[PDB]
Ligand binder design. Structure first.
Ligand SMILES: Cc1cc2c(cc1C(=O)CCC(=O)O)[C@@H](C(C)C)[C@H](C)C2(C)C
Lengths: 214, 220
């Protein structure tokens, strides 16, 4: 298979900036490469073909370059629409291969996360399960570490994490870490703490409750 | 105008076959160019499966050659995909897409919207909805309430906060697998004066099971 490697894998940039994405093929592909754009959620749009040619409808600010095994996509003066995912693809040899993609994220100022920890509801405990939820909302940048400690001891298993895409209003990211236990193990411990690690604070953000509180 | 639209059931049982249809309008699949099938795995990874040319010839990816089958119906102008003996790894979003077309000035490629096809053996199993009220600490001028939807299958689920009048400060996180059943949560941040005097009801709906659960977030 022809190994097309892209870099960077993502990038925080502002409206009006010029960005360059590159794809390197594990061999000479003779300008047989196309660049694709995948928007939120969505579907795909072909940007350029045969290394340098734009497709019908593609705004002039898109440009491709490259020879042999090195190709590049350039987006002069980014616009709001331009913030998406870009992929390169080699079509010179079966099986047509794609690059790992590059995500264009809109940069904004740092923002600390709002942390919230929730005890398992009575309704759930009746069943015999006990999920402890922690929300880390509206933070920046995306890099955040979340530790779940039970009575002062870190817990790895049962931790289910989930992130949202970059919100279109504030441009922040939110995280949800849920710690699923059984009612048996839940009732054998008292301290449950959701601990976050972010550069916006020199000391970890710590939210906790006690199984004995209301 | 050329348009490609995919069709076919979105749920397949392991060991059986996945079959999709791509209806082409605005051009004849016998005239020119290759009509492809590609999939995007959860993780954004893309894989090219194969194609059927205008002459009836097919080219499949080597690693799929024994399980894949690309076929057409010229009179109805649609081509299909059939993946045999699917396993959970085949869970992906499928796209039918064309090679480079030349109708306008510069070439252009056409894509479909893509359909997600999940491979599991789980019966549709409705969600368990739990209200996440604050636990008895600070608070401040803003409250964050939650709604836990767990152990449901298949995807998706619709979560709204009333009935839909509550739009701001709402975060519905994507679903993750947990022993073959899905689990998601949503949070809403309202000023501390509103709740609980101004009720916050979480509305969870699961289409696949004709279920509509309304769980009010009341203070502990
Ligand atoms: C068969 C073919 C398939 C496709 C591509 C090009 C060809 C081509 O072979 C080049 C077109 C031509 O030969 O004129 C890419 C388009 C975006 C350009 C797609 C990734 C893919 C896989 C769907």
């Amino acid at each position: 298979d022809i190994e097309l490697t892209q870099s960077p894998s993502s990038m925080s940039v502002s409206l009006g900036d010029t960005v360059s994405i590159t794809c390197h093929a594990s061999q000479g592909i003779s300008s047989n490469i196309g660049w694709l754009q995948q928007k939120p959620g969505k579907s795909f749009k072909g940007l350029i073909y045969h290394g340098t040619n734009l497709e019908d409808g593609v705004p002039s600010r898109f440009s491709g370059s490259g020879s042999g095994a090195d190709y590049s996509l350039t987006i002069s003066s980014l616009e709001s629409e331009d913030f998406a995912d870009y992929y390169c693809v080699q079509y010179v040899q079966f099986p047509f291969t794609f690059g790992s993609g590059t995500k264009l994220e809109i940069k904004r100022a740092d923002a600390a996360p709002t942390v919230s920890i929730f005890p398992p509801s009575s309704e759930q405990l009746t069943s015999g399960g006990a999920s402890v939820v922690c929300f880390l909302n509206n933070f920046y940048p995306k890099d955040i570490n979340v530790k779940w400690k039970i009575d002062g001891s870190e817990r790895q298993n049962g931790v289910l994490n989930s992130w949202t895409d970059q919100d279109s209003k504030d441009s922040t990211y939110s995280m949800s870490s849920t710690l699923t236990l059984t009612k048996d193990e839940y009732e054998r411990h008292n301290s449950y703490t959701c601990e976050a690690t972010h550069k916006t604070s020199t000391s970890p953000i710590v939210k906790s409750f006690n199984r004995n509180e209301a | 105008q050329v348009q490609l639209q995919e069709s076919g059931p979105g749920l397949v049982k392991p060991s059986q076959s996945l079959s999709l249809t791509c209806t082409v309008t605005g051009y004849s699949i016998t005239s020119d160019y290759a009509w492809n099938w590609i999939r995007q795995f959860p993780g954004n990874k893309l894989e090219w499966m194969g194609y059927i040319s205008y002459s009836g010839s097919t080219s499949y990816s080597p690693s799929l050659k024994s399980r894949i089958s690309l076929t057409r119906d010229t009179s109805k102008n649609q081509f299909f995909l059939q993946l045999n003996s699917v396993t959970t790894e085949d869970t992906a979003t499928y796209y039918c897409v064309t090679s480079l077309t030349w109708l306008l000035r510069r070439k252009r490629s056409y894509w479909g919207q893509g359909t997600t096809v999940t491979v599991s053996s789980a019966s549709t199993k409705g969600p368990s909805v739990y209200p996440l009220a604050p636990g008895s600490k600070a608070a401040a001028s803003m409250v964050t309430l939650g709604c836990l939807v767990k152990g449901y299958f298949p995807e998706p689920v619709t979560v709204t906060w009333n009935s839909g009048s509550l739009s701001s400060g709402v975060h519905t996180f994507p679903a993750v697998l947990q022993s073959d059943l899905y689990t998601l949560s949503s949070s809403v941040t309202v000023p501390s004066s509103p709740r609980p005097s101004e009720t916050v009801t979480c509305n969870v709906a699961h289409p696949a099971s004709s279920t509509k659960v309304d769980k009010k977030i009341v203070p502990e």
